[PDB]
């Protein structure tokens, strides 16, 4: 409904490509807001800029909003304007560069640390106009409302963290992976307590290494000049050795 | 080859919605003896000869007929609210299973085994109450929040009111029936020529408001029992002081970072609290209240504060006058290798960050398999962070446990120790206790085993250790022994060091073990075919060793014979006085009906008297209501009782063989 | 020290052509192998094997399929899509 | 049409009200259709 | 497909009874492969 649950023509914003899930509400009258934030130069090389500078183009999953503090069976979409902190319980956060992970002590919920844009960054044209991708999620935190579940918290604890996964990504520029991911928590007093990280593997490339040669003999007296075509003919998926000779076809 | 159990599965009809509406379960009748054995194996001659039953032939066609509403505008849609639903049995012969089986349009035919209303016997219904919380009466057409008054079940017919037998005059059973909580009702999918049945009305729910979001309030299993409250929080979300009927009371505490309990209060007022961790891990406890009115415990945190050990270690080390108990280390992990910290150091002053960006090391100190192995096959590796890594000791995922007993910080008795193991797959590995000083097996520091022992007062006393086949089974079990070290010791060495003892489980494909071989130097086996199963004890496996010689029990197992809906119909025992003689096989015979319960049972002594006069009757008969409760047990050795409950479940009343009457108040 | 090995084997892979997409496998076989640890047993749960039949909605595949099957003389007769 | 491995096509096309049509001219050869013609090389400028 | 465009044929395919032919009509040289000839340049109009 509003413009940050939506995907759109940069140029034209009547053009929405796609919907995003902004807004749900159950039967028992729970109910769910779903904060995306848009794309955009958020600390960009130069090149980004001089080549292809759109901004609102890929959304992302920025907070989620969970745990009714009133209760209503209404669609909290409302009129498009955005919730309070203070109107929920819980809060899912993904974290895409704004605030350290190798703390000894919680991340905050709030900050000002800007998006990190990775090194790997893509776009997609299916829409027919851009959309770029600058970059992933460094860190997937949830947080409490201790207040509101309790009463007599100290003001400043809408924002309680109570779990975080860090993840590490492989950055080769090329491409770039999920390779560790490790859940934490922290303790009231500022101390890290964790499982063992979940480590992950993805296939290496590496020609300088890895190239080597054979002899063909096999496609012996296959030859591009003449009449001869690479194609996967009967059977398929693998192609095989066509010639078209005068008036008749021969395959291997 | 043959001669299998078949089974299927066959929708009569759905709904718009996908909804089953009618629905047939069909267990098919057993082949008849083939001219060729398929499986005679080392079988007695008599197991093929004596699987052969009624029960395993006969069709069984399980037949239910179901509804749901379906509200829908505009504006609000639910799906698939189940309101009713009624089942019956069929039972037809072998001649009732045309060629190719049973399909849906056989079944669908006018002059089908269930189109054409063929007699059934009824098993039972169940209905459910909606409501939209304002109400007692229920809703003909259930709301959005879908809430439930109470659900509705038959429990008694005529045909259950017929298995009171005799001694219970129907005046008295209708009486007490209602007495009981039954109603006496129509069918939900009713026939022609039925009459009224009687149900139970159970799981009673009573509601909040909107307000509130739609959370009960108040419950009782039924009209029959006290009805209980509790309080939902400011947030409508945890549950809070929950009520009895009785007045009593209990209340609780949460720990909002993980909204789960910590701290219990009982009906005794008395005091029970657990501390989470940063992750949610319950850590130790503590507990207080009176005794003949006079304080004692381990009292409140802010008199018996306590900080638990993060090495596993400490905790052993801990001494009698604590302030908890249940202290609860964590060492998830404790496999995880650990480079001696100022080893490292040193190695770490001109690798560190090498280590550090390549996530061999972490922030904490910790080594990744991965990034390990990486850095090692890209040869950028240093041979002293190779051997400090292979140095460094690693036990598989583990947590301790300090058990005190003493109120406050009176000591007295020593504090029990306990390790927990477990692997990554979720599966215990092994637990020990501590005990006092005495003999105990020897380890080395690397974690190689030692069957010898030698005096300790590290004394552990190792149990359940267990490998598995990294499927879901275990196969390598232990004997308990003691270990001079609490730490784990390794695999390969406990299985080099023969002298200890252990038992080996061999599996088939399915998971179903066939072959218990054991420590004794013996072996429990079993077979299973489609309408027995075989087993066979250590002294008839022990024969195949080639005491009292095992011919003697050799080709002797225990044989369960099972009808179509694999209940046991038949046991099958040998009888041998002297290995050179020959079996009398012994049947004990089990029928079953209507829901499967056992119907009556014989011994083979009195059996084969019955079979030449009919005065014998099963050792045991019964008769039961619909749910399958035996109400009557009648018995050659013990006569008849009979027994009669509520909804509840507990007896109102009950008859004795000798005519006692007892009722309950 | 104990490994659990699984294989799949594919066969009767379709492309739909009409929609731009694949339909999926018509038959995949699975094979588990316990290669477990030495010192353990000298008998060892067996290897085994699912063999699985799919629909790929392509009858070209699709009834072919049967001819794969275990046989049984004594079988119900198999089964036929139904189209209401 | 589909042919074998190297098989050709034989047909003939003709005009079976041949009049003033110069001799041969009432008939053309096929043998391998794409625009085929009853000359190995058609040549406008021929002549004839 | 015998050869690539580097290799070449040595072949003569000759006719039995060359009584009626011109001097050299008796036979044809093979060196392609191809739908070859005999002579570099193949012209039906040749005068020859």
């Given at each position: 409904?509003?413009?940050?649950?939506?995907?759109?023509?940069?140029?034209?914003?009547?053009?929405?490509?796609?919907?995003?899930?902004?807004?749900?509400?159950?039967?028992?009258?729970?109910?769910?807001?779903?904060?995306?934030?848009?794309?955009?130069?958020?600390?960009?090389?130069?090149?980004?800029?001089?080549?292809?500078?759109?901004?609102?183009?890929?959304?992302?999953?920025?907070?989620?909003?969970?745990?009714?503090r009133t209760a209503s069976?209404?669609?909290?979409?409302?009129?498009?304007?955005a919730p309070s902190q203070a109107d929920w319980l819980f809060y899912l956060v993904f974290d895409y560069g704004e605030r350290s992970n190798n703390l000894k002590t919680p991340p905050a919920f709030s900050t000002t640390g800007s998006w990190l844009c990775r090194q790997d960054r893509?776009?997609?044209?299916?829409?027919?106009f851009e959309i770029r991708t600058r970059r992933l999620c460094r860190q997937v935190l949830m947080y409490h409302h201790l207040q509101a579940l309790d009463s007599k918290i100290t003001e400043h604890n809408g924002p309680t963290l109570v779990s975080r996964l860090i993840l590490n990504y492989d950055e080769s520029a090329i491409a770039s992976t999920l390779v560790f991911v490790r859940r934490v928590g922290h303790?009231?007093?500022?101390?890290?307590?964790?499982?063992?990280?979940?480590?992950?593997?993805?296939?290496?490339?590496?020609?300088?290494?890895?190239?080597?040669?054979?002899?063909?003999?096999?496609?012996?007296?296959?030859?591009?000049?003449?009449?001869?075509?690479?194609?996967?003919?009967?059977?398929?998926?693998?192609?095989?050795?066509?010639?078209?000779?005068?008036?008749?076809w021969w395959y291997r | 080859a043959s001669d299998p159990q078949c089974s299927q599965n066959i929708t009569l009809s759905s709904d718009r919605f996908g909804q089953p509406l009618k629905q047939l379960s069909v267990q098919y009748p057993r082949r008849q003896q083939p001219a060729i054995n398929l499986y005679p194996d080392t079988l007695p001659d008599k197991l093929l000869a004596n699987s052969y039953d009624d029960q395993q032939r006969q069709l069984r066609l399980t037949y239910q007929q179901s509804s749901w509403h379906h509200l829908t505008n505009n504006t609000v849609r639910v799906l698939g609210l189940p309101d009713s639903t009624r089942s019956d049995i069929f039972t037809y012969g072998a001649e009732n299973v045309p060629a190719g089986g049973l399909n849906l349009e056989l079944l669908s035919d006018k002059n089908s085994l269930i189109a054409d209303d063929k007699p059934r016997e009824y098993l039972g219904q169940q209905k459910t109450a909606y409501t939209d919380g304002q109400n007692t009466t229920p809703l003909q057409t259930p709301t959005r929040q879908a809430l439930i008054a109470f659900t509705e079940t038959t429990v008694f017919n005529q045909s259950t009111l017929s298995a009171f037998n005799g001694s219970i005059p129907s005046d008295k059973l209708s009486t007490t029936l209602e007495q009981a909580g039954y109603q006496q009702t129509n069918y939900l999918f009713p026939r022609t020529g039925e009459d009224k049945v009687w149900v139970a009305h159970h799981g009673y729910t009573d509601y909040g408001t909107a307000a509130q979001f739609w959370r009960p309030q108040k419950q009782s299993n039924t009209q029959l029992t006290g009805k209980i409250t509790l309080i939902w929080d400011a947030n409508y979300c945890v549950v809070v002081q929950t009520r009895d009927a009785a007045g009593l009371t209990t209340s609780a505490k949460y720990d909002w970072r993980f909204l789960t309990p910590v701290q219990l209060t009982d009906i005794n007022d008395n005091q029970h609290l657990i501390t989470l961790d940063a992750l949610g891990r319950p850590i130790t406890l503590r507990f207080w209240g009176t005794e003949n009115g006079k304080m004692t415990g381990y009292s409140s945190p802010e008199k018996a504060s306590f900080s638990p050990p993060s090495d596993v270690n400490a905790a052993i080390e801990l001494k009698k006058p604590l302030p908890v108990a249940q202290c609860q280390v964590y060492a998830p992990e404790s496999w995880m290798p650990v480079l001696s910290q100022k080893t490292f150091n040193r190695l770490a002053e001109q690798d560190w960050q090498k280590l550090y960006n390549a996530?061999?090391?972490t922030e904490d100190?910790?080594?990744?398999?991965?990034?390990?192995?990486?850095?090692?096959?890209?040869?950028?590796?240093?041979?002293?962070?190779?051997?400090?890594?292979?140095?460094?000791?690693?036990?598989?995922?583990?947590?301790?446990?300090?058990?005190?007993?003493?109120?406050?910080?009176?000591?007295?008795?020593?504090?029990?120790?306990?390790?927990?193991?477990?692997?990554?797959?979720?599966?215990?590995?092994?637990?020990?206790?501590?005990?006092?000083?005495?003999?105990?097996?020897?380890?080395?520091?690397?974690?190689?085993?030692?069957?010898?022992?030698q005096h300790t007062e590290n004394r552990w006393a190792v149990t359940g250790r267990t490998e598995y086949d990294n499927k879901g089974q275990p196969i390598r079990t232990y004997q308990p022994y003691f270990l001079n070290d609490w730490r784990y010791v390794s695999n390969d060495s406990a299985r080099q060091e023969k002298e200890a003892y252990a038992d080996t489980h061999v599996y088939d494909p399915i998971g179903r073990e066939i072959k218990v071989i054991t420590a004794k130097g013996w072996f429990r086996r079993t077979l299973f075919t489609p309408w027995f199963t075989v087993n066979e004890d250590e002294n008839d496996t022990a024969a195949e060793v080639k005491n009292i010689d095992p011919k003697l029990y050799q080709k002797t197992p225990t044989v369960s014979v099972y009808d179509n809906r694999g209940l046991i119909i038949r046991n099958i025992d040998f009888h041998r006085t002297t290995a050179n003689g020959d079996p009398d096989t012994r049947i004990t015979r089990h029928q079953y009906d209507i829901h499967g319960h056992l119907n009556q049972s014989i011994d083979p002594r009195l059996y084969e008297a019955k079979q030449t006069n009919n005065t014998i009757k099963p050792n045991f008969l019964w008769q039961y209501d619909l749910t399958g409760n035996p109400l009557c047990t009648e018995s050659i050795d013990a006569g008849r009782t009979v027994t009669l409950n509520d909804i509840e479940g507990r007896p109102l009343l009950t008859v004795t063989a000798t005519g006692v009457i007892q009722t309950r108040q | 020290g104990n490994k659990l090995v699984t294989t799949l084997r594919y066969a009767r892979g379709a492309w739909d052509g009409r929609e731009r997409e694949f339909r999926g496998f018509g038959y995949v076989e699975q094979t588990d192998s316990h290669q477990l640890a030495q010192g353990n047993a000298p008998e060892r749960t067996p290897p085994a094997l699912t063999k699985n039949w799919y629909a790929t909605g392509l009858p070209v595949i699709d009834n072919a399929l049967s001819t794969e099957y275990w046989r049984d003389d004594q079988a119900f007769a198999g089964f036929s899509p139904r189209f209401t | 049409?589909?042919?074998?491995?190297?098989?050709?096509?034989?047909?003939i096309l003709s005009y079976g009200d041949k009049a003033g049509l110069a001799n041969?001219?009432?008939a053309l050869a096929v043998s391998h259709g794409m625009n085929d013609s009853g000359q190995f090389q058609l040549d406008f400028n021929d002549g004839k």
């Open positions: 409904k509003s413009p940050q649950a939506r995907i759109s023509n940069p140029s034209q914003t009547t053009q929405t490509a796609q919907w995003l899930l902004e807004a749900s509400v159950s039967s028992r009258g729970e109910q769910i807001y779903y904060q995306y934030r848009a794309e955009d130069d958020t600390g960009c090389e130069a090149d980004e800029i001089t080549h292809h500078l759109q901004a609102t183009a890929q959304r992302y999953l920025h907070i989620v909003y969970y745990g009714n069976e209404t669609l909290p979409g409302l009129d498009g304007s893509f776009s997609r044209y299916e829409y027919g303790e009231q007093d500022g101390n890290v307590v964790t499982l063992p990280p979940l480590e992950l593997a993805y296939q290496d490339f590496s020609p300088r290494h890895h190239a080597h040669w054979q002899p063909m003999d096999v496609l012996a007296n296959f030859n591009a000049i003449q009449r001869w075509q690479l194609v996967d003919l009967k059977g398929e998926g693998l192609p095989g050795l066509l010639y078209q000779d005068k008036g008749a | 996530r061999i090391i100190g910790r080594i990744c398999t991965l990034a390990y192995r990486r850095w090692v096959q890209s040869q950028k590796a240093i041979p002293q962070l190779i051997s400090l890594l292979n140095n460094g000791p690693r036990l598989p995922p583990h947590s301790l446990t300090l058990t005190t007993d003493r109120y406050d910080h009176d000591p007295e008795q020593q504090i029990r120790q306990q390790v927990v193991f477990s692997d990554g797959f979720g599966r215990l590995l092994q637990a020990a206790a501590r005990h006092e000083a005495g003999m105990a097996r020897q380890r080395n520091e690397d974690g190689s085993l030692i069957i010898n022992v | - | 049409a589909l042919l074998g491995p190297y098989q050709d096509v034989q047909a041969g001219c009432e």
